[PDB]
Symmetry: D3
């Protein structure tokens, strides 16, 4: 009973990390999980090793690439990120659906290796709103913000490669759209044929 | 642009009828409609012509087959039923999603002509429960009930042909399942790219 | 197996009427129905025979009492009302939960004959609010209003006899309360053991 | 104003710990709490003393039994567990409803000492699903899993002693069933007579 | 005490009509009603006198203007429409919130006479979508559609006059938005102080 | 794009801290935040500096007052509390709506400096319930409780200065009332004119 891989991408300031965390709190670990990526970037305050990321040195990441540790890996704004194959295969084979919060470059690598995976792209409801979300608390220089928005513009040009699109205007609407996609996918005949492997056998008698 | 054609089929005793009506009350005529089939069966008490069905004589339906007026037609439960082509094509072109409540024979003909149609099959939660619903008020003979149940079993044989499976155990749940499918499909990239065209242009500088 | 008999009573001005209709629209005829009482009162405008009530003459209702046709009967607000036994027993045996919208006199007679019946009493949120609802469009005389309010107070005296109390302040809340009771009862072990019989056998090797 | 004790039992792999935690996050501490049991078992990673359990040595547990510290205690798969009487009585007398996540042996002891307590049993939706939930991440030997399933089979044979049954097929449905039971129980006339001690006094005037 | 007067205006193609009906089905006649306007336009098929509109002749409506029977009146889409004063004042005095589905001309006259009236404007999600809804079944000429769209644009010019803006993209969302406004207003201090008068007295010793 | 300040006050035992925390978990930080106050009171177990409060010595608080650090400050039951101006102005100017959990004295100071802020007062559903909530786990002396209730009585006399009133009888109802207020306020024409700054421009063409 193999589970389904879900790809979730978005520019910074579309609210993707908060949409996925809120989805996860409604779901037991036997239905849905998130993958823990590897990264070279510094742990932020509040972040714990093995929960959000496995944090590693540049040289250790390199080692991992060279021994084919990764289902996908990429550089994103000055650091490396990747999804280790072993833990993914292991969780999917227990029937769990697994969320991959990754950029468009990782999404592409996943699509070719796992053609069944479903990908969701999240957009902000406008440029004005994107800019206000991107600015955060509002203490970065104009320059640092132009570079941010430019990285976001790059991410967004890749949206058409995804199977679903969520416009995250209003958080609760968008959360509901995300739950709706996963729920609809579980109503697919292949999935249902199984988990319901005969009630159906009992129906056709 | 084009709305999506939905096919919904079910044995009797699966609550499919009330599920579709309930869904329509929450949905504007510009989003979602049901197709008005032609048939030779008699109107039920309190059932208006042109709203549930176009009711015609045996002789009239046979001449409609000759004029090639139907996208599908079939014989179901001792009467003839057909889906007039002109109205489907006309409602779909205005962007409305159109539901076809038709049997498995009909669904096959539509699949061949309209291959992006999506199909929903609806099952009862058990055989005993199927029997309890078919029996209804329990005033019918054992002989009539026997014929309804064999027809139901025969209908259920063809489930594996459909894209989606809903197990209608609890009505509200099954209603949320039908609403869920419709909503997820509207979140697909092909339709969202259309609906949010202006937004996407702005966002990509 | 057997459906559950529900009794619902309330003074007028407690919104009990619309609560029951609203509940029924969300619920199939094979899950939940309302009992059709006989009465001597006139039909209201736009009120059909056999659907809300079986409307009979004073002389006809008196002969129904003699034939022992009622599970309960009583005099309410200057007219006679009764619950025909045959249809209750017949709907209940098909597994349908049946609601009896009857007064306190009726509820006592049913309690004695049918001791697993469950009863719901419905109260207004205050006396002032009760008065505001009773007054309605405010076109009635102070004398008629005076008689409606004494009847309401008399009805409310008998609340402590019922299994459940709903305070109907906010309609949607009170609707969720009525849906909630019905749903919890269906979760009781006696009914769930029946509904999931096949599952339980499998589970226990 | 004494609160209600709720008993929640299930085999491992019916998702009970996750159903109760999610219920609790919707409820303030003046309405609903969980009891903190005593156990001899080792704290898992993430577990904190006094939150999930009071962790104690074998000898300390023994001391507690001998001085009648426990409303119930039992051995469950190679460790001891129990509910201390003092903290329970103290919380219930402040009107809080208290959840006891305990096995069937503890449930029995509670039933005799507190006959008002309501018990809920949770089942998995099938054996296949139970087995997949039981297997977790999927790294235990076949042997260790047969023993797990055998402990689960034992738990499940005791389900008929409970007042309610939840089949935990779909987490959100099952969570809603749990909230529905507590909510229905609060609509009971005894409870309502109190918390609403006169609005009612004001109604009967 | 007094209910609140609501004004709702919208171009056609904003789904305002079905939004108001849908809202009313969830709401008792003692909480919320729609005003019955007089008009000279013909009844639509299946549209009853005194329930949607009081339908009168041109000559009758002109004499109603002379008797000062209207709180507002105006000419809309080639016919005359008016809000009879007596019924508004009479329903409002019984504590009912009354909705006026009227155009911008009407809303101005009501604002001047009734300055605590609250007003809701409803917009379509885009021009293309507005066009798609106006076109409807697509059987009208390009000339008629042209006149409907100029009327819609003219109506939308006056939006900035209203207290509240609802963008009706997704029906259920827009329905929740209309329910939300009504509910928040009932939470204002002036109305809550009235509704919970007895409670507040007790609470303040 | 300036955000809206929300004031939330209540006596102890109306459940205000739990209502606000639950609201916040549904909202991303770019829509809604809570302010972190300064206080001289001791950190409770579980409390962390900079999350719930900035904890400071009596002398440091004094320093802050003397250099005009505070938008509002006050003494509440033997300790000082205040909201620093800088962090507030900074967050509001990024378009975030900010919740201020403060007493009636702070509310007043905020009202004069920021006349756009919206204030919500929460009441317990009765004195009996207030007293039971105030008593907590139930281990304080009668005397300590009379003083508690007396501080609560003082808070409650100031309720009429607030724009909204929530009666927190049932947690989920009250949470929904709180979400409804914020949501309604976002439907106001001033707010909507902006975030929707032309779709509208595109509508009037
Ligand atoms: N290819 C790939 N991208 C990743 C992976 N993990 C995170 N990212 C991307 O890294 C980007 C920034 O991540 P992060 O430092 O956590 O900031 P944030 O997620 O926007 O708050 C996001 O677009 C992620 O999609 C990964 O394992 N593989
Ligand atoms: N193929 C075909 N079947 C139809 C059509 N309309 C209705 N049916 C089927 O014939 C059966 C109709 O039963 P009906 O008289 O409406 O009673 P119902 O089952 O409660 O709807 C159902 O299975 C429908 O799916 C049609 O247009 N074409
Ligand atoms: N005991 C008895 N009372 C009934 C029966 N049917 C209706 N009633 C009661 O008589 C009253 C009927 O009022 P009705 O004419 O229907 O106006 P309503 O109050 O809005 O329903 C209500 O209190 C009902 O409970 C019945 O079958 N038996
Ligand atoms: N009798 C009794 N059983 C308990 C008590 N606390 C926990 N248990 C049972 O111990 C079993 C396993 O508990 P645990 O080690 O926490 O694993 P888990 O709850 O399945 O994740 C469950 O069936 C509980 O019902 C208790 O205080 N008394
Ligand atoms: N001012 C004024 N306008 C009204 C009144 N009643 C309806 N209208 C407006 O006239 C138009 C009526 O259109 P109608 O014939 O009902 O078709 P509809 O647009 O689907 O409701 C709408 O814009 C209404 O707002 C009224 O009493 N006074
Ligand atoms: N004026 C003002 N009051 C505050 C501030 N922060 C907290 N309070 C008030 O202090 C009172 C007690 O706070 P606390 O010690 O946290 O107890 P609790 O909030 O009831 O659990 C509450 O009424 C708050 O409204 C503040 O920054 N300014
Ligand atoms: N406008 C705004 N966005 C914020 C603030 N704090 C965090 N964010 C955004 O919230 C998201 C983090 O979940 C990012 O898009 C941040 O930039 C704030 O104070 N204002
Ligand atoms: N069990 C049962 N099913 C019914 C009753 N009335 C209608 N039905 C069923 O409800 C469905 C129509 O809503 C059909 O499947 C009918 O057979 C009844 O009294 N009992
Ligand atoms: N306050 C008020 N109650 C009404 C009105 N019309 C009907 N009702 C009440 O609404 C209920 C019927 O739905 C009854 O309790 C009626 O008295 C009205 O205009 N105002
Ligand atoms: N199938 C599956 N169940 C898991 C996994 N991780 C945890 N669980 C289950 O989730 C529950 C813990 O809440 C237990 O029933 C675990 O066995 C996993 O990766 N796969
Ligand atoms: N696109 C579309 N709109 C429709 C159709 N039928 C009715 N409407 C629209 O739906 C609304 C009435 O519910 C109006 O705005 C109508 O123009 C249809 O078939 N297609
Ligand atoms: N009745 C009651 N209230 C409690 C208990 N524990 C905490 N609270 C209340 O819950 C609130 C804290 O969120 C305060 O009003 C506390 O007094 C308890 O055991 N019983
Ligand atoms: K990641
Ligand atoms: K059909
Ligand atoms: K009745
Ligand atoms: K426990
Ligand atoms: K009107
Ligand atoms: K604070």
């Amino acid at each position: 009973a193999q589970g389904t891989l879900y790809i979730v991408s978005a520019p910074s300031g579309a609210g993707k990390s908060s949409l996925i965390q809120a989805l996860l709190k409604t779901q037991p670990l036997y239905d849905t999980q998130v993958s823990v990526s590897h990264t070279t970037r510094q742990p932020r305050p509040g972040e714990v090793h093995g929960e959000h990321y496995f944090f590693v040195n540049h040289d250790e990441f390199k080692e991992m690439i060279s021994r084919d540790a990764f289902l996908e890996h990429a550089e994103v704004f000055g650091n490396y990120y990747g999804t280790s194959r072993e833990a993914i295969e292991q969780v999917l084979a227990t029937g769990v659906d697994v969320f991959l919060d990754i950029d468009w470059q990782g999404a592409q690598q996943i699509r070719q290796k796992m053609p069944h995976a479903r990908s969701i792209f999240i957009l902000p409801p406008s440029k004005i709103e994107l800019d206000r979300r991107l600015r955060g608390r509002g203490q970065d220089s104009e320059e640092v913000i132009a570079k941010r928005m430019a990285q976001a513009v790059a991410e967004m040009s890749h949206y058409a490669e995804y199977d679903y699109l969520i416009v995250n205007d209003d958080f609760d609407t968008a959360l509901t759209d995300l739950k709706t996609i996963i729920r609809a996918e579980r109503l697919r005949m292949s999935r249902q044929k199984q988990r319901h492997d005969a009630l159906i056998s009992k129906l056709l008698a």
